[PDB]
Nucleic acid binder design. Structure first.
Ligand SMILES: [Ca+2]
Ligand SMILES: [Ca+2]
Ligand SMILES: [Zn+2]
Ligand SMILES: [Zn+2]
Lengths: 553, 366, 553, 366
DNA sequence: GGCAGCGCGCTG
DNA sequence: CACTATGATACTT
DNA sequence: AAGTATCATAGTGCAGCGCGCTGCC
DNA sequence: GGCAGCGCGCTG
DNA sequence: CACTATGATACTT
DNA sequence: AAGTATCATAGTGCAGCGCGCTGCC
């Protein structure tokens, strides 16, 4: 008759049904008298079960993100309000989840409850990015809230290095670059350009991350027997504007373009391949103990750096998904430059009229067969149309003088052929000859720009394509890819963040409401829930491919 | 002439300045000297307080002078000279040793000490020398950051204070502590760690020789400014190491070198006053002076809650500590919109008062 | 065991559960095997029942809003896409709803199935208003879609004039100025400033409305017996920017300020009370048959008019709810003008610095006790704080010279005392002495501005307060109010309109998706549904007022 | 000289004009005369086409001249004179009767007829006289709207056409109908209502005396322009009263006053041609002329679907109707970006070609 | 030796 | 060569 | 008549900065 | 007699 | 003196 | 221990136009 509360809790989340609506449906089928879903007092018992902070290591949830006094304005507290977790409990509660997966994951060997025997080598990733223009409330105070929010989350990818000579991957979380495998850590209302605050909220999380990393742990008193793990991370969701203003460097660059190598702006040459690692801190001190702007000024700098270098592990950083936007802003720009017979990238007073008019003509012509409404701030759906295997002739159809047309399609064709390296979730398990030839293939692709075009602008992502990808995937003890290591799982999460706040969560008080954003957003992404909900068997129709016909319909 | 009117000085129209209306006086710390070369009014009458109202980093723009002439206040210059590697809310101490003169310009040495960090959110003990030199119609600057290499007897880096000294090579006093968060500290940083120590700081030889005394531990977050002319220096309240016990003050505390012909006999005393109500400090800053007495602001322009007393508010307190019958009265309180962030402007044997604020860019005048 | 489909259809709408989510919950409790809600194939049978166009008068739904050819571009078709209904079917289907209400509404007389005996006199209202900045799709064409949408809906208020000498109101729809009693007629994507299109979509709806109005109808072959009605309407949701650019007149005015009277800009006098009615059309023709800009130029004009006067019944128009915004922009402006000692409303080069600085001071001071984040485009929640009985001292606390302070609070106190006339749903059933003295009371209120202030600006809504309210409520055969005749039910409906489109309805094709907006938005507001759903009895606690204590908690 | 190049004329930089780049040639209708007073180039060489390229209401700004000089095209003036009470897409007919001259300026009378409404979305028969007068360096305007009061034998108001006439007081021809929606009409307005009538329109006496003929009913939406010099006038296709049958044309239709010394013997004939492919009209407008032949544009710059034939496209068709062996050839087709909205510029005994477009503000030249 | 404009390109 | 989201409807079961 | 599959696409990544010239001091 | 700026106030 | 929407929790049943 | 009630507030109303001066022709 009556039911299981975990079934109801799994039922609620895929609806994104707010709590009062579930109470209303419970009351309706109660008043009609149907043996049905559980009451919410049966829910909020086990709602505190899945909250973090219920394990041990190698009691109030939802801690305030200020953690100092109120009545004494001696510290200049910056304008920020939000809720965070302790990071280690957030690691451990996710570790409680995949325990049963490891049980069916320790196959072809077994020997499962052997604690000092088989130590599991897991590896994950994290990152943070800001927001823009979320609504502001009454706030009853004497200082505003600057419109924006910070979020910090982290995923889980692999769990096998330290295994046998038959070192075999046993769990990959098959999506993996998405929502519903992103566990939240930090939500706060703040701002990051006149920043002041990342050292208040995000700073101590990284100072905890240093104590986390590179250590054998045990999920202490898990469930009956324990289970050990070796935690490893990979910080690469820190896309370029975040990269340098807290990785010490300077954003637009104009002297050193990469946050991995040392390279001149004006080099379209073969390679750099240098891998600066944490040296810059020492070159802070030489600027700090001697003549801040007048010592070693553009003299010893492998790369310019103002501050003393927040978040730590700088030998690993690139994104994949957040390069298609700059690749599109590169190639559509090149097509516009080709459209009117101009040269020398600029907006000169007798050239930019031709440039803007040809760009408007390209916009209307691309509208007459495809879609481009906006002009600025390209979207990834507009990116993927510009690299699909079809529609290549439609992107060049106004370009006369067909030799330039053939070369312009040929460079894009090289780009399609060699684009499959990144935004592939697992290379080294596919396309491995392309993986072992991609450096020479990308040198050829830059060579095609080198001879058919005298322009050669090298923006901040071409140097992250024609180098820093072959050796990056090739590198030992990393992961061996960039695609599954990307940063789209936060961004669709940001699509949820307005959606879980703008008329979803507690309203009427800012700090009391953002906590209820974070609580249900933590409950949204437990795999223990999504394995228990929405898991049925659809009616089979012989793999939905063919009777013997009709690849479509 | 003490007890003079408000003088809300004239605001800036942002017509030839930056896009701030000069309202960026929040979190600022500076010095000022009555000094020659009237490069802002070449007149045979107008003696001029020369000044550089910005000496900060993350508080504002990097550095900036002001048109404090003889009487009135306007703009005269806009800098971003030595653009912001500088300190957070720290101190702005006594002027450094003078240099050999030049035909047309005069030399200045500024010491900066203590403060937060805009990048690490922790302690900092940035001992900083800044060379300032004023010729007519422009100036120059040089930066001399000195970390702990040249430092001897390094004091603990800490939150906030002011610093006073005899004009050359002598004692510089009483920083204010932080309950700093470190690795494995983030829960319950409402504890109480203490030093409460004298330290004589030679300006050239970077050495914090701590002067011997059985240490009065509490009350190091605010203080006053050292006075000449049968000298004295006073500390005022504002802290109980915890952020949980208030600092309702009814007495003062004199730190003074006793026999000032040498630098010896460092003692300590407290003197209760003719207390008007209670609670000398509104958990904020006054620190200013006068010519035979003190000028002590600091009260709540907005009544943030005192913990035990419902006393503190925006009025002026003036202490008659120079009199052996040490009493407290008031000047007629020019209850303008000011409060809670004041910086000083003194003069010997006369009353000439200036001041700044957070964003109500104005002038406190007596 | 199994259930009623109307119960399920009522269950879905208060959730705003999208159709696939209901299919998902059906599949989940089906796979768990619980005798529960109906399948969606049981829904879409009776989903076509409640659609309009299932009655007769005195078969495809969802008609296209172009209704001419595609292959022949001879007419210059303007950029518009949307779906409308035939208006008369939309009247009749709502008439089918309240039939059972009339059955229990014909009380103390009875004689219910007597068709030529008791003719029911109903009366209603309508109106339309635009939108702003809704997302644009690919559209696969050679012309854009200008970002915006038009909506047109209509309510139902009263149903009794032609009854006995004991003429008694029998049904009032108790909310009534809200959503869930608004039935849609027109949704379209268009624009109205470089308009062209209101004569295409809205125009024929009004040309149908002329054939609708002032006629005894019968809801032909209703349910067993028929039922007659006498339809009457009242077009007043047409707030000021809509009022004149299709009521012929000129928006800012500066010579004639009211769309009911003829009045000079510079008259703060006693009254006007003139009631121009449809005369302007004749003064179009005298400008049309003679010297368009050089005949009767400011000579015969009771009011300036360019065009030949779209939508008809111009003797009735004002709003109540959309005056609080201009009243707040009046009174906060007056308080700012009082704050610094200035005169003569302007922004003069030596006065507007004082004005802007005092306004910023008032903004920060009101922030230190209440809430005002924005500056432009006031909201009604910010309006109602400025007229609440408390907080009056906080709005004047910076104003020194306490005689002006007392007068400034006194004028607002008159405004609170006499504000209860409008935004009351039914005067003539309450406050009737205020109703019979409000003209002299408002003359006194304008007299208070007259003597304590030498400024006297008369904006376009003070003339709609100190006149045109007493006689408007007093007028025979109207309704007898303005408050329940207001225009807020559309605007919260606009809050639903993004909400039913932005990731709710059909997506991928604009015209096919906006139809599914309109269909579910028509299904959202049937009273036959909301009487069948969410109607339970809460557990009583003796009227939730007192045991004998505690008016709060 | 026929068969001359493209001449994409020089665009406007919006530096001294409005914020449209002169791209508002969509939905425009105007006239132009080779006429004296060279007020745009006072030179003893440059004969100048005087022009007013805007004569509309809801299409664009109200009225506007253009810098069509002798050879080149630029801007020379910007008007909003008599700011928009005017007509929708209507016609722009033959010039009115001349007035007594003045020392320094010349007189013009413009007739406007037919069109939609920007306010009612229905028919309109706005017979409109506009007085135009050109002095150097400025002009003037007067408006004379005449509704049905002065109208005698009122024709049915209707959609679209052009109008041609002998230069004074004679026949003005062949409007194009609307399937207008009225009260109780809104469902299935794809019907077919017809007049298809001659009507002689005296310009002064407002009387549409319908000329006697057994009426050829179909094909009244487009036409050509009347030709002098052994005169003729031709109608071209574009309609089947329904919007559902195409107008794939392989022949023409001559409406001409037979013996032009009087105005008599109104007959009708059709002549099949040396047809190149098919489908003379792309359901759009050509209507222009030449000196011994026609200049007929009109094709699809963008291939909107012809109903039965997949024929029509943007090229030029030139008809040799003046020859008794009436044939059709092509000039070398200057396949620019143009198409689907052209307006004429003719000259007798010589080829001088101009034209406008929708928003590709250019020049069609032969 | 600055120095504050254009003037724009980098990534948002 | 992100995934997750929407509602008819044509084509299997 | 039940049940997927397919069709096309929206959602969200949303200003500082640092050059490189320039006369121009 | 226009006439196109400020210059802003009306209602959005 | 619009209504409808959100989630604890204090106070009734 | 079940059930309302209370607490505070977000949501949405989101550029044309028409004066009234002005020298300025
Ligand atoms: Ca971001
Ligand atoms: Ca609106
Ligand atoms: Zn690199
Ligand atoms: Zn009026």
């Amino acid at each position: 008759s009556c039911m299981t509360p975990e079934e109801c809790l799994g039922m609620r989340l895929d609806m994104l049904m707010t709590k009062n609506q579930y109470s209303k449906e419970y009351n309706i089928l109660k008043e009609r008298g149907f043996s049905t879903l559980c009451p919410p007092k049966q829910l909020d018992a086990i709602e505190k079960t899945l909250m973090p902070g219920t394990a041990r290591y190698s009691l109030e949830p939802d801690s305030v993100t200020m953690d100092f006094h109120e009545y004494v304005p001696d510290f200049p507290c910056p304008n920020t309000k939000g809720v965070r977790f302790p990071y280690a409990h957030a690691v451990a509660k996710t570790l409680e989840e995949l325990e049963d997966e490891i049980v069916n994951g320790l196959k072809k060997l077994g020997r499962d409850p052997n604690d000092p025997t088989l130590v599991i080598h897991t590896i994950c990733k994290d990152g943070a990015d800001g927001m823009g223009d979320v609504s502001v409330h009454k706030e009853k105070s004497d200082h505003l809230l600057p419109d924006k929010a910070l979020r910090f989350s982290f995923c889980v990818l692999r769990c096998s290095v330290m295994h046998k000579d038959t070192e075999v991957t046993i769990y990959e979380d098959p999506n993996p670059n998405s929502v519903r495998s992103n566990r939240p850590v930090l939500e706060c209302i703040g701002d990051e350009n006149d920043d002041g605050t990342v050292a208040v909220c995000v700073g101590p999380i990284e100072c905890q991350r240093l104590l986390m990393k590179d250590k054998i742990m045990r999920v202490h008193m898990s469930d009956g027997t324990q289970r050990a793990h070796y935690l490893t991370f990979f910080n690469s969701m820190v896309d370029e504007k975040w990269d340098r203003a807290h990785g010490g460097l300077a954003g637009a660059g104009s002297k050193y373009l990469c946050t991995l190598c040392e390279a001149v702006r004006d080099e379209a040459l073969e390679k750099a391949g240098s891998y600066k690692i944490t040296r810059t801190l020492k070159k802070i001190e030489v600027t700090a103990s001697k003549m801040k702007y007048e010592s070693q000024e553009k003299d010893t700098f492998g790369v310019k750096g103002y501050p003393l270098l927040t978040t730590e592990p700088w030998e690993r950083g690139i994104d994949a998904t957040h390069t298609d936007i700059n690749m599109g802003n590169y190639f559509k720009s090149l097509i516009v430059r080709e459209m009117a017979q101009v040269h020398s990238w600029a907006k000169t007073a007798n050239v930019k009229k031709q440039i803007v008019d040809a760009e408007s003509k390209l916009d209307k012509h691309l509208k007459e067969s495809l879609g481009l409404n906006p002009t600025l701030m390209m979207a990834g759906n507009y990116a993927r149309e510009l690299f699909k295997a079809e529609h290549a002739d439609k992107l060049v159809a106004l370009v006369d003088k067909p030799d330039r047309k053939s070369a312009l399609v040929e460079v894009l064709a090289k780009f399609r052929q060699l684009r499959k390296v990144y935004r592939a979730n697992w290379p080294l398990n596919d396309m491995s000859d392309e993986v072992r030839q991609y450096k020479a293939k990308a040198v050829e692709m830059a060579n095609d720009l080198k001879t058919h075009f005298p322009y050669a602008p090298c923006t901040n992502y071409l140097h992250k394509v024609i180098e820093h990808v072959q050796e990056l995937i090739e590198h030992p003890s990393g992961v061996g890819s960039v695609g599954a290591l990307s940063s789209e799982g936060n961004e669709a999460g940001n699509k949820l963040f307005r959606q879980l706040r703008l008329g979803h969560a507690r309203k009427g008080n800012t700090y009391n409401g953002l906590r209820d954003v974070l609580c249900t957003h933590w409950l949204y992404t437990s795999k223990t829930l999504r394995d228990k909900a929405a898991x049925x068997x659809x009616x089979x129709x012989x793999x939905x491919x063919x009777x013997x016909x009709x690849x479509x319909x | 002439m003490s007890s003079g009117p408000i003088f809300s000085s004239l605001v800036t129209d942002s017509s030839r300045s930056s896009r701030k209306k000069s309202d960026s006086a929040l979190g600022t710390e500076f010095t000022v000297v009555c000094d020659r070369v009237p490069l802002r009014d070449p007149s045979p009458t107008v003696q001029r307080f020369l000044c550089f109202v910005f000496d900060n980093g993350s508080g504002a723009m990097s550095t900036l002078p002001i048109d404090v002439g003889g009487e009135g206040i306007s703009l005269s210059d806009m800098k971003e000279v030595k653009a912001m590697p500088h300190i957070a809310s720290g101190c702005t101490a006594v002027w450094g040793p003078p240099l050999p003169p030049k035909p047309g310009k005069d030399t200045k040495q500024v010491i900066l000490w203590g403060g937060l960090d805009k990048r690490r959110w922790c302690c900092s003990n940035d001992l900083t020398q800044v060379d300032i030199t004023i010729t007519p119609k422009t100036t120059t600057a040089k930066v001399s950051i000195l970390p702990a290499d040249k430092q001897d007897g390094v004091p603990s880096p800490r939150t906030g204070h002011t610093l006073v000294a005899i004009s050359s090579l002598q004692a510089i006093l009483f920083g204010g502590l932080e309950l700093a968060s470190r690795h494995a500290r983030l829960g319950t940083c409402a504890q109480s760690c203490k030093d409460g120590y004298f330290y004589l700081l030679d300006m050239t030889t970077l050495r914090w020789n701590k002067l011997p005394l059985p240490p009065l531990v509490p009350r190091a977050y605010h203080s006053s400014t050292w006075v000449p002319a049968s000298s004295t220096m006073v500390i005022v309240g504002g802290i109980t190491y915890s952020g949980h016990c208030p600092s309702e003050r009814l007495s003062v505390s004199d730190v003074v070198c006793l026999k000032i012909s040498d630098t010896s006999q460092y003692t300590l005393t407290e003197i209760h006053m003719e207390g008007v109500r209670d609670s000398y400090v509104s958990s904020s800053s006054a620190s200013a002076l006068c010519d035979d007495r003190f000028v002590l602001y600091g009260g709540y322009h907005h009544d943030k809650s005192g913990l035990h007393p419902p006393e503190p508010s925006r009025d002026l307190y003036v202490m008659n500590l120079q009199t052996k019958k040490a009493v407290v009265h008031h000047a007629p309180t020019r209850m303008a919109s000011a409060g809670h962030t004041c910086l000083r402007l003194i003069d010997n044997s006369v009353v000439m008062i200036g001041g700044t604020c957070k964003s109500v860019n104005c002038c406190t005048n007596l």
